[model samples]
Target chain A: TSELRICRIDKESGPCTGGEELYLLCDKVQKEDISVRFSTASWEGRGDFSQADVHRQFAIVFKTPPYEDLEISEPVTVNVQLQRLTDGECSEPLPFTYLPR
Target chain B: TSELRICRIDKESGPCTGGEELYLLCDKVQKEDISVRFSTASWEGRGDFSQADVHRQFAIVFKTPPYEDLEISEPVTVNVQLQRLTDGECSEPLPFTYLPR
Candidate 1:
Protein backbone atom coordinates (compact mmCIF):
# COMPACT_ATOMS: atom_id res chain seq x y z
CA THR A 1 0.00 0.00 0.00
CA SER A 2 1.71 3.18 -1.22
CA GLU A 3 0.80 6.22 0.85
CA LEU A 4 1.31 9.90 0.06
CA ARG A 5 3.56 11.79 2.46
CA ILE A 6 3.98 15.54 2.96
CA CYS A 7 7.14 16.65 4.73
CA ARG A 8 6.66 20.44 4.62
CA ILE A 9 4.79 23.30 3.01
CA ASP A 10 7.23 25.80 1.47
CA LYS A 11 5.51 28.80 3.08
CA GLU A 12 3.39 27.53 5.93
CA SER A 13 1.97 30.97 6.71
CA GLY A 14 0.49 33.80 4.68
CA PRO A 15 -2.29 36.36 4.50
CA CYS A 16 -5.85 35.13 4.15
CA THR A 17 -5.85 36.33 0.57
CA GLY A 18 -6.98 33.39 -1.52
CA GLY A 19 -5.39 32.15 -4.73
CA GLU A 20 -1.95 32.13 -3.16
CA GLU A 21 0.35 29.37 -4.41
CA LEU A 22 2.56 27.11 -2.25
CA TYR A 23 4.73 24.09 -2.81
CA LEU A 24 4.45 20.81 -0.92
CA LEU A 25 7.42 18.48 -0.84
CA CYS A 26 6.15 14.93 -0.63
CA ASP A 27 6.67 11.24 -1.43
CA LYS A 28 4.74 8.64 -3.48
CA VAL A 29 3.08 11.38 -5.55
CA GLN A 30 2.03 10.98 -9.16
CA LYS A 31 0.39 13.01 -11.92
CA GLU A 32 -2.97 11.34 -11.34
CA ASP A 33 -2.95 12.10 -7.63
CA ILE A 34 -5.93 14.10 -6.47
CA SER A 35 -5.44 17.85 -6.03
CA VAL A 36 -4.95 19.19 -2.52
CA ARG A 37 -7.89 20.53 -0.55
CA PHE A 38 -8.21 22.97 2.36
CA SER A 39 -10.51 22.92 5.35
CA THR A 40 -11.44 24.24 8.76
CA ALA A 41 -14.16 23.02 11.13
CA SER A 42 -16.81 25.03 9.25
CA TRP A 43 -15.42 25.43 5.76
CA GLU A 44 -13.76 23.69 2.83
CA GLY A 45 -12.25 24.76 -0.47
CA ARG A 46 -11.22 22.24 -3.11
CA GLY A 47 -7.91 22.79 -4.92
CA ASP A 48 -7.44 22.74 -8.69
CA PHE A 49 -3.94 21.36 -9.17
CA SER A 50 -2.97 20.91 -12.80
CA GLN A 51 -0.37 19.18 -14.95
CA ALA A 52 2.05 22.10 -14.83
CA ASP A 53 1.80 22.29 -11.06
CA VAL A 54 3.15 18.85 -10.28
CA HIS A 55 6.95 18.63 -10.20
CA ARG A 56 7.78 15.11 -11.27
CA GLN A 57 6.54 12.62 -8.64
CA PHE A 58 7.78 14.27 -5.46
CA ALA A 59 6.32 17.80 -5.10
CA ILE A 60 3.10 19.64 -5.86
CA VAL A 61 2.44 23.34 -6.36
CA PHE A 62 -1.09 24.36 -5.35
CA LYS A 63 -3.18 27.41 -4.58
CA THR A 64 -4.79 28.28 -1.28
CA PRO A 65 -8.56 28.44 -1.36
CA PRO A 66 -10.31 31.65 -0.45
CA TYR A 67 -11.35 31.90 3.18
CA GLU A 68 -14.87 30.52 3.43
CA ASP A 69 -16.08 33.02 6.02
CA LEU A 70 -14.09 36.13 5.21
CA GLU A 71 -17.01 38.38 6.08
CA ILE A 72 -17.69 36.77 9.43
CA SER A 73 -14.20 36.25 10.89
CA GLU A 74 -10.61 37.42 10.92
CA PRO A 75 -7.54 35.38 10.06
CA VAL A 76 -7.54 31.86 11.49
CA THR A 77 -5.47 28.73 11.19
CA VAL A 78 -6.54 25.91 8.86
CA ASN A 79 -5.32 22.52 7.66
CA VAL A 80 -4.21 21.03 4.31
CA GLN A 81 -4.42 17.53 2.94
CA LEU A 82 -4.12 15.59 -0.30
CA GLN A 83 -7.16 13.61 -1.46
CA ARG A 84 -6.04 10.39 -3.08
CA LEU A 85 -7.97 9.66 -6.24
CA THR A 86 -6.83 6.09 -6.54
CA ASP A 87 -7.78 4.75 -3.14
CA GLY A 88 -9.32 7.73 -1.33
CA GLU A 89 -6.37 8.02 1.08
CA CYS A 90 -6.04 11.50 2.56
CA SER A 91 -2.73 12.50 4.00
CA GLU A 92 -2.81 13.65 7.59
CA PRO A 93 -3.99 17.24 7.54
CA LEU A 94 -1.25 19.76 8.34
CA PRO A 95 -1.71 23.11 10.04
CA PHE A 96 -1.19 26.47 8.37
CA THR A 97 -2.17 29.82 9.79
CA TYR A 98 -4.01 32.41 7.80
CA LEU A 99 -3.03 35.93 8.84
CA PRO A 100 -4.97 39.11 8.24
CA ARG A 101 -3.02 41.43 5.98
CA THR B 1 -2.10 51.69 -25.54
CA SER B 2 -0.70 48.28 -24.65
CA GLU B 3 -2.79 45.49 -26.07
CA LEU B 4 -2.18 41.90 -25.01
CA ARG B 5 -0.75 40.15 -28.01
CA ILE B 6 -0.35 36.42 -28.62
CA CYS B 7 2.26 35.44 -31.12
CA ARG B 8 1.55 31.71 -31.09
CA ILE B 9 0.30 28.72 -29.16
CA ASP B 10 3.12 26.18 -28.66
CA LYS B 11 0.88 23.30 -29.77
CA GLU B 12 -1.75 24.24 -32.30
CA SER B 13 -3.42 20.87 -32.25
CA GLY B 14 -4.02 17.97 -29.89
CA PRO B 15 -6.46 15.20 -28.96
CA CYS B 16 -9.71 16.16 -27.29
CA THR B 17 -8.24 14.87 -24.08
CA GLY B 18 -8.93 17.68 -21.69
CA GLY B 19 -6.49 18.95 -19.08
CA GLU B 20 -3.70 19.12 -21.64
CA GLU B 21 -1.37 22.07 -21.04
CA LEU B 22 0.00 24.38 -23.72
CA TYR B 23 2.13 27.48 -23.79
CA LEU B 24 1.16 30.73 -25.41
CA LEU B 25 3.88 33.18 -26.38
CA CYS B 26 2.49 36.63 -25.78
CA ASP B 27 3.41 40.29 -25.16
CA LYS B 28 2.38 42.99 -22.63
CA VAL B 29 1.40 40.38 -20.06
CA GLN B 30 1.55 41.12 -16.33
CA LYS B 31 1.24 38.88 -13.33
CA GLU B 32 -2.06 40.50 -12.41
CA ASP B 33 -3.40 39.68 -15.86
CA ILE B 34 -6.31 37.30 -16.14
CA SER B 35 -6.08 33.62 -17.02
CA VAL B 36 -7.22 32.35 -20.41
CA ARG B 37 -10.64 31.07 -21.52
CA PHE B 38 -11.92 29.08 -24.50
CA SER B 39 -14.90 29.17 -26.84
CA THR B 40 -16.55 27.84 -29.95
CA ALA B 41 -19.87 28.44 -31.69
CA SER B 42 -21.65 26.15 -29.25
CA TRP B 43 -19.36 25.67 -26.24
CA GLU B 44 -17.22 27.56 -23.76
CA GLY B 45 -14.70 26.54 -21.14
CA ARG B 46 -12.99 28.97 -18.78
CA GLY B 47 -9.32 28.44 -18.02
CA ASP B 48 -7.93 28.47 -14.51
CA PHE B 49 -4.44 29.73 -15.18
CA SER B 50 -2.26 30.32 -12.15
CA GLN B 51 0.98 32.06 -11.11
CA ALA B 52 3.19 29.00 -11.49
CA ASP B 53 2.00 28.62 -15.06
CA VAL B 54 2.88 32.09 -16.30
CA HIS B 55 6.41 32.63 -17.51
CA ARG B 56 7.24 36.18 -16.51
CA GLN B 57 5.45 38.53 -18.97
CA PHE B 58 6.02 36.57 -22.14
CA ALA B 59 4.22 33.25 -21.84
CA ILE B 60 1.22 31.53 -20.31
CA VAL B 61 0.69 27.80 -19.80
CA PHE B 62 -2.92 26.61 -19.60
CA LYS B 63 -5.06 23.49 -19.96
CA THR B 64 -7.64 22.64 -22.53
CA PRO B 65 -11.10 22.39 -21.13
CA PRO B 66 -12.90 19.06 -21.29
CA TYR B 67 -14.77 18.64 -24.54
CA GLU B 68 -18.28 19.81 -24.02
CA ASP B 69 -21.11 17.63 -25.41
CA LEU B 70 -18.66 14.79 -25.73
CA GLU B 71 -21.61 12.46 -26.08
CA ILE B 72 -22.71 14.20 -29.25
CA SER B 73 -19.53 15.55 -30.80
CA GLU B 74 -16.48 13.68 -32.01
CA PRO B 75 -13.64 16.13 -32.71
CA VAL B 76 -13.93 19.85 -33.21
CA THR B 77 -12.05 23.13 -33.45
CA VAL B 78 -12.14 25.89 -30.87
CA ASN B 79 -10.62 29.31 -30.24
CA VAL B 80 -8.61 30.56 -27.26
CA GLN B 81 -8.31 34.05 -25.84
CA LEU B 82 -6.94 35.67 -22.72
CA GLN B 83 -9.42 37.51 -20.51
CA ARG B 84 -7.83 40.70 -19.24
CA LEU B 85 -9.03 41.43 -15.73
CA THR B 86 -7.68 44.97 -15.76
CA ASP B 87 -9.85 46.36 -18.53
CA GLY B 88 -11.62 43.30 -19.92
CA GLU B 89 -9.65 43.36 -23.16
CA CYS B 90 -9.41 39.87 -24.63
CA SER B 91 -6.68 38.95 -27.04
CA GLU B 92 -7.66 37.88 -30.52
CA PRO B 93 -8.98 34.35 -30.15
CA LEU B 94 -6.65 31.87 -31.80
CA PRO B 95 -7.61 28.65 -33.47
CA PHE B 96 -6.83 25.28 -31.90
CA THR B 97 -8.10 21.96 -33.15
CA TYR B 98 -9.28 19.38 -30.65
CA LEU B 99 -9.01 15.90 -32.19
CA PRO B 100 -10.55 12.62 -31.14
CA ARG B 101 -8.25 10.41 -29.15
Candidate 2:
Protein backbone atom coordinates (compact mmCIF):
# COMPACT_ATOMS: atom_id res chain seq x y z
CA THR A 1 0.00 0.00 0.00
CA SER A 2 1.12 3.60 -0.69
CA GLU A 3 -0.10 7.03 0.38
CA LEU A 4 0.76 10.74 -0.22
CA ARG A 5 0.42 13.46 2.35
CA ILE A 6 0.54 17.25 1.79
CA CYS A 7 2.69 18.78 4.50
CA ARG A 8 2.23 22.36 3.29
CA ILE A 9 2.02 24.72 0.31
CA ASP A 10 3.82 28.06 0.57
CA LYS A 11 3.70 31.12 -1.68
CA GLU A 12 6.95 32.93 -2.39
CA SER A 13 5.18 35.81 -4.12
CA GLY A 14 5.05 37.82 -0.93
CA PRO A 15 7.35 38.98 1.81
CA CYS A 16 5.34 37.67 4.76
CA THR A 17 4.70 34.44 2.90
CA GLY A 18 5.56 31.11 4.46
CA GLY A 19 8.59 29.12 3.43
CA GLU A 20 8.16 27.21 0.17
CA GLU A 21 8.80 23.81 1.65
CA LEU A 22 6.36 21.14 0.51
CA TYR A 23 6.98 17.78 2.13
CA LEU A 24 5.87 14.23 1.31
CA LEU A 25 6.51 11.53 3.92
CA CYS A 26 6.88 7.96 2.62
CA ASP A 27 6.71 5.20 5.15
CA LYS A 28 6.99 1.35 5.22
CA VAL A 29 9.84 1.35 2.72
CA GLN A 30 13.33 0.75 4.10
CA LYS A 31 13.75 4.55 3.85
CA GLU A 32 16.65 4.06 1.44
CA ASP A 33 14.27 2.50 -1.09
CA ILE A 34 12.19 5.66 -1.46
CA SER A 35 13.19 8.24 -4.04
CA VAL A 36 11.01 11.00 -5.52
CA ARG A 37 10.82 12.03 -9.15
CA PHE A 38 8.83 15.27 -9.49
CA SER A 39 7.43 17.93 -11.85
CA THR A 40 5.97 21.40 -11.33
CA ALA A 41 3.35 23.30 -13.31
CA SER A 42 4.58 26.45 -15.04
CA TRP A 43 3.17 29.92 -14.24
CA GLU A 44 1.23 30.22 -17.44
CA GLY A 45 -1.91 28.95 -19.11
CA ARG A 46 0.21 26.58 -21.16
CA GLY A 47 0.61 23.27 -19.33
CA ASP A 48 4.11 22.53 -20.57
CA PHE A 49 5.37 21.04 -17.31
CA SER A 50 8.42 19.27 -18.76
CA GLN A 51 10.98 21.82 -17.60
CA ALA A 52 9.88 21.21 -13.99
CA ASP A 53 10.95 17.58 -13.79
CA VAL A 54 13.35 16.46 -11.08
CA HIS A 55 14.72 13.08 -9.95
CA ARG A 56 15.64 12.74 -6.29
CA GLN A 57 14.42 12.23 -2.77
CA PHE A 58 14.02 14.29 0.48
CA ALA A 59 13.84 17.78 -1.14
CA ILE A 60 13.06 19.41 -4.48
CA VAL A 61 12.19 22.98 -5.44
CA PHE A 62 9.89 24.62 -8.04
CA LYS A 63 9.91 28.36 -8.50
CA THR A 64 7.11 28.19 -11.04
CA PRO A 65 3.45 28.56 -10.10
CA PRO A 66 0.58 26.79 -11.89
CA TYR A 67 -1.37 29.77 -13.25
CA GLU A 68 -0.66 33.16 -14.79
CA ASP A 69 -3.37 34.93 -12.79
CA LEU A 70 -2.20 36.45 -9.53
CA GLU A 71 -5.14 34.94 -7.75
CA ILE A 72 -3.95 31.42 -6.86
CA SER A 73 -7.42 30.51 -5.62
CA GLU A 74 -8.91 31.48 -8.95
CA PRO A 75 -9.01 27.81 -9.79
CA VAL A 76 -5.70 27.23 -11.52
CA THR A 77 -5.57 23.48 -11.05
CA VAL A 78 -2.29 21.62 -10.65
CA ASN A 79 -1.69 17.94 -11.27
CA VAL A 80 1.59 16.25 -10.38
CA GLN A 81 1.93 12.65 -11.55
CA LEU A 82 4.81 10.97 -9.69
CA GLN A 83 6.50 7.66 -10.59
CA ARG A 84 8.79 5.52 -8.47
CA LEU A 85 11.80 4.34 -10.47
CA THR A 86 12.53 1.41 -8.14
CA ASP A 87 9.37 -0.67 -8.80
CA GLY A 88 7.99 1.56 -11.58
CA GLU A 89 4.70 2.45 -9.85
CA CYS A 90 3.13 5.81 -10.60
CA SER A 91 1.44 7.91 -7.95
CA GLU A 92 -2.09 9.11 -8.65
CA PRO A 93 -1.22 12.86 -8.58
CA LEU A 94 -0.44 15.72 -6.22
CA PRO A 95 -2.41 18.83 -7.14
CA PHE A 96 -3.89 21.77 -5.25
CA THR A 97 -5.20 25.31 -5.75
CA TYR A 98 -2.39 27.88 -5.69
CA LEU A 99 -3.53 30.31 -3.01
CA PRO A 100 -1.36 33.41 -3.22
CA ARG A 101 -1.20 35.60 -0.15
CA THR B 1 15.68 10.85 -22.28
CA SER B 2 11.87 11.21 -23.00
CA GLU B 3 9.58 13.62 -24.86
CA LEU B 4 5.85 14.55 -24.67
CA ARG B 5 4.71 17.08 -27.24
CA ILE B 6 1.04 18.05 -27.63
CA CYS B 7 -1.25 16.86 -30.39
CA ARG B 8 -3.80 19.61 -29.70
CA ILE B 9 -7.56 19.07 -29.28
CA ASP B 10 -9.63 22.15 -28.52
CA LYS B 11 -13.28 22.54 -27.43
CA GLU B 12 -14.78 25.05 -25.04
CA SER B 13 -18.17 23.30 -24.44
CA GLY B 14 -20.26 26.18 -26.05
CA PRO B 15 -20.62 29.72 -27.45
CA CYS B 16 -17.15 29.66 -28.99
CA THR B 17 -16.54 26.17 -27.62
CA GLY B 18 -12.94 25.32 -26.70
CA GLY B 19 -12.32 23.03 -23.80
CA GLU B 20 -10.11 24.34 -21.12
CA GLU B 21 -6.96 23.48 -23.28
CA LEU B 22 -6.26 19.70 -23.72
CA TYR B 23 -4.10 17.33 -25.80
CA LEU B 24 -2.11 14.05 -26.15
CA LEU B 25 1.54 13.11 -26.85
CA CYS B 26 3.35 9.76 -26.58
CA ASP B 27 6.48 8.06 -27.89
CA LYS B 28 8.66 4.92 -27.96
CA VAL B 29 10.59 4.64 -24.78
CA GLN B 30 12.55 1.51 -24.09
CA LYS B 31 8.54 0.45 -24.37
CA GLU B 32 8.24 -2.91 -22.57
CA ASP B 33 8.63 -1.84 -18.94
CA ILE B 34 5.65 0.55 -19.25
CA SER B 35 2.73 -0.08 -16.93
CA VAL B 36 -0.06 2.52 -16.88
CA ARG B 37 -1.69 3.59 -13.61
CA PHE B 38 -5.12 5.08 -14.39
CA SER B 39 -8.00 6.46 -12.31
CA THR B 40 -11.13 7.97 -13.88
CA ALA B 41 -13.43 7.97 -16.89
CA SER B 42 -15.83 10.52 -15.56
CA TRP B 43 -18.47 11.99 -18.07
CA GLU B 44 -17.52 9.98 -21.12
CA GLY B 45 -18.60 6.39 -21.79
CA ARG B 46 -14.93 5.68 -20.89
CA GLY B 47 -11.89 6.73 -18.66
CA ASP B 48 -12.39 8.49 -15.29
CA PHE B 49 -9.13 10.50 -15.38
CA SER B 50 -9.64 11.14 -11.66
CA GLN B 51 -9.69 14.93 -12.35
CA ALA B 52 -7.23 15.99 -14.98
CA ASP B 53 -3.99 14.36 -13.80
CA VAL B 54 -0.93 16.07 -15.42
CA HIS B 55 2.54 14.57 -15.15
CA ARG B 56 5.93 16.04 -16.03
CA GLN B 57 5.75 15.89 -19.78
CA PHE B 58 1.94 15.55 -19.92
CA ALA B 59 -1.25 17.56 -19.65
CA ILE B 60 -5.13 17.40 -19.65
CA VAL B 61 -6.99 20.63 -18.88
CA PHE B 62 -10.72 21.49 -18.64
CA LYS B 63 -11.90 25.05 -19.15
CA THR B 64 -15.36 26.50 -18.41
CA PRO B 65 -16.71 27.38 -21.80
CA PRO B 66 -18.55 30.60 -22.68
CA TYR B 67 -22.19 29.54 -22.76
CA GLU B 68 -24.67 26.73 -22.17
CA ASP B 69 -26.11 24.79 -25.12
CA LEU B 70 -23.05 26.15 -26.89
CA GLU B 71 -21.96 24.57 -30.16
CA ILE B 72 -18.79 22.71 -29.26
CA SER B 73 -16.58 21.47 -32.07
CA GLU B 74 -16.20 17.89 -30.85
CA PRO B 75 -15.48 15.68 -27.82
CA VAL B 76 -12.36 16.65 -25.83
CA THR B 77 -9.79 13.91 -25.38
CA VAL B 78 -6.95 14.63 -22.93
CA ASN B 79 -4.91 11.46 -22.56
CA VAL B 80 -1.87 12.13 -20.42
CA GLN B 81 -0.53 8.65 -19.96
CA LEU B 82 2.48 7.61 -17.91
CA GLN B 83 5.34 7.89 -20.34
CA ARG B 84 8.86 6.68 -19.50
CA LEU B 85 9.65 7.53 -15.89
CA THR B 86 12.79 5.51 -16.19
CA ASP B 87 16.02 7.13 -15.09
CA GLY B 88 16.92 5.23 -18.22
CA GLU B 89 13.67 2.68 -19.37
CA CYS B 90 10.43 1.34 -21.77
CA SER B 91 5.46 1.24 -22.72
CA GLU B 92 1.34 1.35 -23.89
CA PRO B 93 -1.81 3.40 -23.25
CA LEU B 94 -5.58 3.58 -24.04
CA PRO B 95 -5.42 7.33 -24.66
CA PHE B 96 -7.79 10.26 -23.65
CA THR B 97 -10.73 11.79 -25.52
CA TYR B 98 -13.97 13.83 -25.28
CA LEU B 99 -16.92 13.45 -27.66
CA PRO B 100 -20.30 15.17 -28.46
CA ARG B 101 -19.51 18.81 -28.93
The most accurate candidate by TM-score is 1
**Tens-digit lDDT track of model 1 for A1-101:** 24434433433333233344544434434444334534333433433456566553212222333334334335454443333323433343333334443
Which pairs clash (backbone N, Cα, C closer than 3 Å) in model 1? Answer: none
Tell me the TM-score of chain B in each candidate: 0.48, 0.19
Question: Per-residue lDDT of B1-101 in model 2, one digit per residue for the tens?
Answer: 24321222121111111112322222322222332221222311111122223222322221211222124355333322122323211111222232332
The clash count of every prediction, one per candidate, is: 0, 21
Model 1 chain A: weakest 10-residue lDDT segment is: A56-65
Give candidate 1's fnat, 2 decimals: 0.00
Quality of model 2 by C-alpha lDDT: 0.25
Could you give candidate 2's per-residue lDDT for residues A33-77 as a string of tens digits? 222222112211111222232222222211222233444434333
* DockQ winner: 2
**Model 2 residue A56 lDDT?**
20
lDDT of 2 at A36: 26
| DockQ of all models, two decimals each | 0.02, 0.03
**When superposed on Cα atoms, how far off is each prediction in RMSD?**
23.7, 20.9
Fraction of native contacts (fnat) of each candidate: 0.00, 0.00
Report, for every candidate in turn, its global Cα lDDT versus the true structure.
0.39, 0.25
